[PDB]
Design a binder for this molecule. Sequence first.
Ligand SMILES: O=C(O)c1ccc(-c2cccc3c(CCCOc4cccc5ccccc45)c(C(=O)O)nn23)cc1
Length: 150
Amino acid sequence: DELYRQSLEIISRYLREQATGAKDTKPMGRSGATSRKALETLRRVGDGVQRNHETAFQGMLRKLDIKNEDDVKSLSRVMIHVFSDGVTNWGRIVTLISFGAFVAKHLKTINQESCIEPLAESITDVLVRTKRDWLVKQRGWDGFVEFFHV
Ligand SMILES: O=C(O)c1ccc(-c2cccc3c(CCCOc4cccc5ccccc45)c(C(=O)O)nn23)cc1
């Protein structure tokens, strides 16, 4: 599963940099030019997705009532339910990830930073397992980077 692997590399870094405010500096296994540009794109558009969904994101986080790893482990089904409504596009993929950054930041705030890694794992698992056909047609992260170009 190359698409899982790549998806995980991008999402884990973006959540950690959103949570920490630290530009992530962990090297990947090798050059990933698309992966670095996809992180750049999340940086640029992810931030403003959160500012436009400030109200629904807080209301969603309220409901979820997240305090720990058991809780982070128990999000998969709700994630799926909300995400597979309507129809698939890159805007909703950004929403998923950007809400992921919102919850990451919540986790740091509640001193549960070590949960960000499994949270990134859950989002990747759901993304690839629910939207695989569509991502493969859209050419994955290159498609993503082209869609929000400049
Ligand atoms: O009435 C509105 O305007 C509105 C807009 C957006 C949302 C909303 C909030 C959070 C996430 C999310 C998504 C992403 C799918 C599920 O994401 C998640 C749901 C639950 C927990 C999650 C934890 C981490 C990452 C995503 C999560 C979508 C969408 O599909 O359009 N819409 N949302 C809810 C209500």
